[PDB]
Design a protein around this ligand. Structure first.
Ligand SMILES: [Mg+2]
Ligand SMILES: [Mg+2]
Ligand SMILES: [Mg+2]
Ligand SMILES: [Mg+2]
Ligand SMILES: [Mg+2]
Ligand SMILES: [Zn+2]
Lengths: 136, 50, 175, 112, 86
RNA sequence: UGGAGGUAAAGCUACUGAAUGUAUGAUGGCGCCACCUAGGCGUACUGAAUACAAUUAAACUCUGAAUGCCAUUUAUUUUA
RNA sequence: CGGUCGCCUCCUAAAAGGUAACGGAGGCGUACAAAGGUACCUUCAGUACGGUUGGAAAUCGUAUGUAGAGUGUAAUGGUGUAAGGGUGCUUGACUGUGAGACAUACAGGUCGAACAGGUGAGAAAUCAGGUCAUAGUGAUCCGGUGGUCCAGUAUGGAAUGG
RNA sequence: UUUGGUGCCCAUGUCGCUGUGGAAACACCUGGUUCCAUUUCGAACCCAGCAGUUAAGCACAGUGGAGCCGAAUGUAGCUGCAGUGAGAAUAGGAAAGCACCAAGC
């Protein structure tokens, strides 16, 4: 579970992901990267599931770089309660993912194996994924 | 509230002209300044008044 | 005076030792300071007066005591409560109180063999520490209940430390 | 650390800042510069940043007790009918030679 | 049934004093009018303008009002008043 | 037409928090021998500090618009 | 039931100003005869080398650094030759006023040139009507206290009022 | 025109590195007995003297090291799919500039 060790302010404004990927536009460390075509919020749990999928299918030869991180927290009002009279406690952390952010990327392992690893990863994430390759 | 203020009065004519603030707990000394007095028309020594 | 020997020989000596052709590229000794660090005045042991008097006795400079510029809870020294003392002596006093050490005091040390191999700053300064002020002649046996040392420095007008080597060697210091 | 001359320039900057902020009338400021060898004076007319008159030891005088750099500048300004100035010690202190200059300047028809 | 909540502890704030700019450029002003209201000198007083101990930029003579750039990276703002052709 | 401003956006060896990797590796922890104290050995790891590449922010800012605003110019209109 | 009830600063507040919510964070019900006013002088903290007691860290001199220091206190804004630190002298922590503006439903709040009296600092210009700025406080009635070129139920006083 | 002083400008003005010069000037320097002064001291302030100095400050030439500045194109946001146009990045500039005064020129 990825989680900031400690944050300044516990209850911040939600960040709309409707943009075109300020930062992380392009793959930067490996040969192949996973891109999104619809911005969304993927929490720490989904990052964990994607990471473990890539690691399990990667074998003991290659490397995986995670680019996004659940910097932002998020709240959830307890159930069966009227509205108002405060702001609910923070529950789960989430990484904002704009459209077109290369979030995962792999290295040092055959081509087809990397494509399969990325496909096995992007099925855990809600964002409609896509495959990009490093430039030259 | 805390009633920390105090009043200064001239000594020649004994009016109670001025008002100021003084914290007794540190400097127990009675203030003795010299300021303008409207009756006396000059700078006279003012000293504290209860 | 030791200044006599300097202004008689040293200028020519170190001018010829290093190819300068500038009579005062030779290093010049600029000031000397004395510090003790009287920290046994937690609140008031003797309130530093013994230190002030004895340091007045050794040097013609009137001693001055510095106030703490920090706040330390580990001791009773926070934001005030002056500790230590400081002399910054010069003129005839600088040259004379210097030799008065090297010709009187250091032969009277517990063991004066050698130093200054590694005590240079590397920018033209030097320091000497003394573990007890009772050794020096300008004092009687009576003192504070504790006897402390001294911190003295030699700062010159050159930044290259080998020049300081040359100046202090030309002045016959114990290396 | 400082060079005894950049520091003096700094004190002068302090003084000129106070003057340029405070001088509500258009009084011409009378700057004196003190050098180890001798002394000089110039009268900066602010609000136009030009110089009106000046004086120095180099008016065929000797090495600066030479308050003569006061009488001549007093004459030059009173010929311009201003005679209401404000003094400027550069970075120096209003003492010694500067005082001997300023008093001579005052006692010949100036008002400052 | 109901549910347990309470203790917001953050329902407080202060009146908003209307600090900002009062005379923009080009304005003809008379001595005593306040040009600029601020907390701390966001604008320095230039020529023919005084500063009131509330850090208030207020005029001292008739004339057109002008803002200007100065400072170590041309990021500080001066305000000043220019006399007319008198 | 001139001007105040610090948003959208952008950026983070330009500070504050958060924070990914490679290289150098300190602080340490696992062992470890001498020695009973001052300490050495390689550290599957936590990562001081720095370099190189790459990130996030309503209460982060070295930077930064357009619209809007203020006042003024010119033309026209309205007596509100 | 619980919480809150006035005032102050930031964010929300959409680059003027304003702008709600049981929206997000926090403070005040002051403190200082010097932490006021003025003249003069002086300008970081930190780190590295160097040095008896003395230690991670006191102090000492040296350089380095461009503010991470300080600024009585909450946060913000501003301020490195300042509005910060030291010193000498004082008390303008004045009286009587107030053109012209700000922001305002009213009440109230805020800023202030300039003028007269008599001062302090200073060679002089100048500065000073409390502090770097923003909170630090509560109407009216009633009654009391001090001064008085006010009246005093026929007159002189007094009581009682002003 | 060059030297010195100084105001305006706020780094394309700096920080530094290598050399050149000091007649007049600017500092250094020499003394502290005087006016004056150090939380202590002729360090500094302040006097009165210029024997020696180009060492250092100051100026001048070269230095593309750090720091600083930064075009065009293209892009992001905008405001009724065209005009508006940044930031970051880049080529690249850059060893300051504007005046007045006194000297010898
Ligand atoms: Mg944004
Ligand atoms: Mg103050
Ligand atoms: Mg205060
Ligand atoms: Mg206050
Ligand atoms: Mg009667
Ligand atoms: Zn009286």
């Amino acid at each position: 579970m990825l989680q900031p060790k400690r944050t300044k302010y516990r209850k911040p404004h939600n960040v709309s992901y409707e943009g075109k990927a300020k930062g992380n536009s392009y793959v930067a460390f490996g040969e192949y990267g996973l891109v999104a075509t619809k911005g969304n919020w993927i929490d720490a749990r989904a990052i964990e599931s994607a990471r473990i999928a890539i690691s399990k299918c990667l074998g003991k030869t290659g490397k995986m770089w995670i680019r996004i991180f659940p910097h932002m927290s998020k709240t959830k009002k307890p159930l069966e309660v009227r509205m108002g009279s405060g702001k609910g406690n923070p529950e789960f952390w989430v990484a904002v993912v704009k459209q077109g952010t290369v979030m995962f990327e792999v290295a040092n392992i055959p081509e087809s194996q990397m494509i399969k690893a990325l496909t096995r990863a992007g099925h855990k994430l809600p964002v409609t994924w896509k495959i990009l390759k490093r430039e030259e | 509230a805390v009633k920390r203020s105090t009043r200064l009065g001239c000594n020649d004519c004994r009016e109670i002209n001025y008002l100021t603030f003084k914290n007794v707990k540190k400097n127990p000394e009675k203030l003795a300044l010299n300021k303008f007095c409207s009756r006396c028309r000059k700078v006279v020594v003012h000293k504290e008044v209860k | 005076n030791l200044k006599a020997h300097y202004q008689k020989t040293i200028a020519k000596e170190l001018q010829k030792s290093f190819a300068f052709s500038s009579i005062m590229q030779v290093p010049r000794l600029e000031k000397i300071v004395i510090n003790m660090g009287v920290g046994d005045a937690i609140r008031d042991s003797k309130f530093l007066e013994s230190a002030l008097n004895e340091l007045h006795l050794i040097s013609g400079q009137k001693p001055v005591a510095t106030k703490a510029k920090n706040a330390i809870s580990t001791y009773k020294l926070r934001a005030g409560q002056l500790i230590g003392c400081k002399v910054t002596l010069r003129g005839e006093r600088m040259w004379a109180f210097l030799e008065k050490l090297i010709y009187v005091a250091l032969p009277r040390v517990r063991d004066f063999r050698g130093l200054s191999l590694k005590s240079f700053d590397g920018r033209g300064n030097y320091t000497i520490g003394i573990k007890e002020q009772i050794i020096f002649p300008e004092i009687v046996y009576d003192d504070i209940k504790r006897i402390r040392g001294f911190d003295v420095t030699l700062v010159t007008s050159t930044n290259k430390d080998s020049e300081a080597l040359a100046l202090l060697r030309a002045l016959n210091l114990p290396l | 650390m400082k060079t005894r001359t950049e520091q003096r320039r700094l004190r002068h900057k302090r003084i000129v800042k106070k003057i340029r902020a405070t001088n509500h009338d258009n009084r011409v400021v009378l700057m004196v510069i003190k050098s180890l060898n001798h002394i000089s004076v110039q009268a900066w007319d602010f609000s136009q940043n030009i110089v009106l008159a000046s004086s120095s030891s180099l008016a065929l005088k000797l090495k600066n007790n030479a308050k003569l750099v006061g009488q001549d500048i007093a004459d030059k300004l009173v010929k311009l009918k201003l005679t209401n100035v404000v003094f400027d010690t550069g970075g120096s202190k209003y003492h010694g030679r500067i005082a001997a200059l300023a008093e001579a300047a005052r006692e010949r028809g100036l008002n400052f | 049934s109901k549910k347990g909540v309470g203790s917001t502890k953050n329902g407080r704030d202060s009146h908003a004093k209307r600090l900002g700019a009062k005379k923009a450029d080009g304005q003809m002003i008379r001595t005593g009018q306040i040009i600029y209201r601020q907390r701390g000198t966001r604008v320095y007083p230039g020529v023919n303008v005084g500063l009131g101990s509330d850090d208030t930029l207020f005029a001292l003579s008739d004339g057109l009002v002008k803002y200007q750039k100065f400072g170590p990276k041309q990021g500080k703002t001066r305000v000043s008043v220019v006399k007319h052709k008198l």
